[PDB]
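quick q for whoever's on today - can somebody do inverse folding on this one?? i tried earlier but teh output was garbage lol. tokens:
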């Protein structure tokens, strides 16, 4: 490994970090777009204000502005639905640990309410909000409204640090290991430069996903994140062992491996910076299928890569890993849906199921209102695209169970619905091969009408190989494809995955059966359930 491989490939030129002209050969077109103009200048040099003034039809007539809206705007959290909702933008937040407020929730609703049939919102597999319908001339004013309610959307798409995921039961669970809200909160601020923008970590070769583990249940999915913080004592000090490189991609899925490093709790942020700088400095920037952090780790080796993190640390010490973490391997992951006692006596939380994560403006207002009336104005999102409303005086529960909105967003849905996860699909996503959200609900419904079960089978539905709905963690996973019916007609279909496990004994699922027409999945899934999961025919 020639020591010239270890040379930083980016420079801080003019407050922004850019590829050095010697390392700019044979790069992918997303590296070029970033070279041509720095994406952070759209927020940090307020250049959205004037881009927002150009008709969409004009913007498309020159490469430079077409890349503004189709590419660079993703650093502002805005994603052009070019194919399926032309001239409309999806918008994704920073919502560390998935904690929102009623007033944030109400503001998001008032933005999507405006767009009518073209608007709705969604809870994501990184316990985040997305809103849809957004038009460009509205961006400057939405940005201002987001800030006003204490939210940022910065650096949530493209080559950025994505939503910091944490324990959905942080601060409320008797059985928590460590409260992850400070650490995800700190990480988000670091990333976004306390909502101003942070160009030091805004030009990675590829997306990068952190989590901070606080549950024995491992609700955080540490195994599939580029950096996972595993609570662990070392030499009497509380800290985190570090796992690195977990990712999913059309080409390759790989679980996170130990860096062989521990940090004390106060080093969470500087080790995040060190790894990211290493990644940004040294990361490969050709073929996009070969750009995530694991590919660098495989080229340098784990000790190669580790030495590079160590030299970007303060004091340049990176302690070796504590041989055990605080996570109990004896643990049955817990159903958070329903009413549960909090550690603060007299109080309860409620997990409410949100069918495939999909909400309309009216829905968001109802949940905002339950949080205000029954809780403390707080709503928490989950990675299965559900909600928790914490801090409810247990004496209010009886009245809450009677609220009409709880027939739609239930604390006790049938067990297959409890764990159903589906990505956007082709209603809005231009990469999608199939419609996922409506389809998955319809299939799950007909399957559950047929069988009854005790084990909580988790079914994930994803619209294309990008696997945003993470079919490799599911008990039964469905990946969109096109296939053929008995007459050779093109029909939507799914590859069915099995074998995915979560919690400490985590495992990646693989395709069990390819190209099953979607209209044939009910009998197949019914049988799989009966034969493999203890389901009983009704
Ligand atoms: C919304 C969400 C799925 C959802 O219904 O929940 C989704 C959204 C899409 N992802 Fe994802 N990703 C989401 C979960 C993830 C995850 C799960 C996770 O993070 O744990 C995965 C797999 C895990 C991983 O990345 O390590 C993921 C895999 C990707 C990939 C494949 C990555 C790769 O290295 O090849 C793409 C395509 C790409 O990056 O080139 C992508 C790109 C896309 C885009 C941005 C593509 C596009 O612009 O059309 C999707 C936007 C569709 C839309 O309009 O909503 N999305 N995506 C999730 C939003 C997360 C967030 O709030 O930040
Ligand atoms: S898995 Fe594919 S279809 Fe689904 S949201 Fe991600 S990119 Fe779109
Ligand atoms: O956009 S995806 O990477 O969450
Ligand atoms: Cl993106
Ligand atoms: Cl598109
Ligand atoms: K859900």
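ok took a stab at it. sequence:
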């Amino acid at each position: 490994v020639a020591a010239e491989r270890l040379e930083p490939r980016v420079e801080e030129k003019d407050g922004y970090w850019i590829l050095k002209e010697q390392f700019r050969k044979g790069i992918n077109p997303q590296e070029k777009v970033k070279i041509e103009k720095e994406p952070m200048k759209l927020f940090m040099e307020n250049g959205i204000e004037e881009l927002a003034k150009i008709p969409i039809e004009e913007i498309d007539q020159s490469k430079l502005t077409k890349d503004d809206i189709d590419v660079r705007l993703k650093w502002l959290g805005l994603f052009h639905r070019r194919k399926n909702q032309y001239g409309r933008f999806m918008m994704r937040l920073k919502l560390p640990n998935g904690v929102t407020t009623s007033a944030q929730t109400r503001y998001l609703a008032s933005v999507i309410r405006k767009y009518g049939k073209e608007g709705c919102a969604d809870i994501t597999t990184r316990q985040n909000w997305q809103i849809r319908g957004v038009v460009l001339p509205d961006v400057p004013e939405i940005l201002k409204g987001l800030a006003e309610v204490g939210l940022t959307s910065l650096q949530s798409g493209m080559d950025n640090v994505r939503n910091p995921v944490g324990n959905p039961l942080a601060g409320i669970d008797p059985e928590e290991i460590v409260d992850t809200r400070p650490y995800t909160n700190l990480l988000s601020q670091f990333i976004t430069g306390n909502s101003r923008g942070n160009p030091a970590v805004s030009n990675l070769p590829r997306k990068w996903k952190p989590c901070v583990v606080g549950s024995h249940d491992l609700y955080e999915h540490p195994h599939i994140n580029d950096l996972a913080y595993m609570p662990a004592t070392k030499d009497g000090r509380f800290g985190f062992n570090l796992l690195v490189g977990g990712f999913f991609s059309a080409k390759r899925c790989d679980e996170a491996i130990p860096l062989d490093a521990w940090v004390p709790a106060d080093d969470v942020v500087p080790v995040c910076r060190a790894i990211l700088e290493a990644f940004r400095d040294l990361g490969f920037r050709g073929n996009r299928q070969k750009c995530r952090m694991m590919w660098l780790i495989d080229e340098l080796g784990v000790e190669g890569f580790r030495a590079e993190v160590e030299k970007r640390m303060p004091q340049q010490q990176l302690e070796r890993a504590s041989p055990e973490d605080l996570v109990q391997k004896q643990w049955e992951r817990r159903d958070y849906l329903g009413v549960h006692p909090q550690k603060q006596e007299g109080y309860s939380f409620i997990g409410l199921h949100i069918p495939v994560g999909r909400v309309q403006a009216d829905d968001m207002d109802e949940l905002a209102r339950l949080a205000d009336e029954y809780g403390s104005g707080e709503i928490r999102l989950t990675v299965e695209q559900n909600i928790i409303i914490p801090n409810i005086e247990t004496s209010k529960i009886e009245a809450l169970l009677k609220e009409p909105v709880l027939s739609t967003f239930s604390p006790d849905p049938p067990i297959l619905m409890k764990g159903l996860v589906a990505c956007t699909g082709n209603q809005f996503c231009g990469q999608a091969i199939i419609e996922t959200k409506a389809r998955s609900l319809k299939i799950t419904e007909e399957v559950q009408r047929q069988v009854s079960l005790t084990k909580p089978v988790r079914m994930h539905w994803t619209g294309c190989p990008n696997t945003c709905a993470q079919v490799q963690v599911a008990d039964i996973g469905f990946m969109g494809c096109l296939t053929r019916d008995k007459n050779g007609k093109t029909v939507e279909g799914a590859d069915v995955f099995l074998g995915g496990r979560i919690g400490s004994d985590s495992h990646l699922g693989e395709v069990y059966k390819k190209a099953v027409p979607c209209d044939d999945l009910v009998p197949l899934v019914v049988d799989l359930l009966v034969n493999n999961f203890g389901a009983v025919p009704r």
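fwiw The chain has 15 helices and 23 strands. also The chain has three domains: 1-149+336-413, 150-335, 414-538. so keep that in mind when u check it
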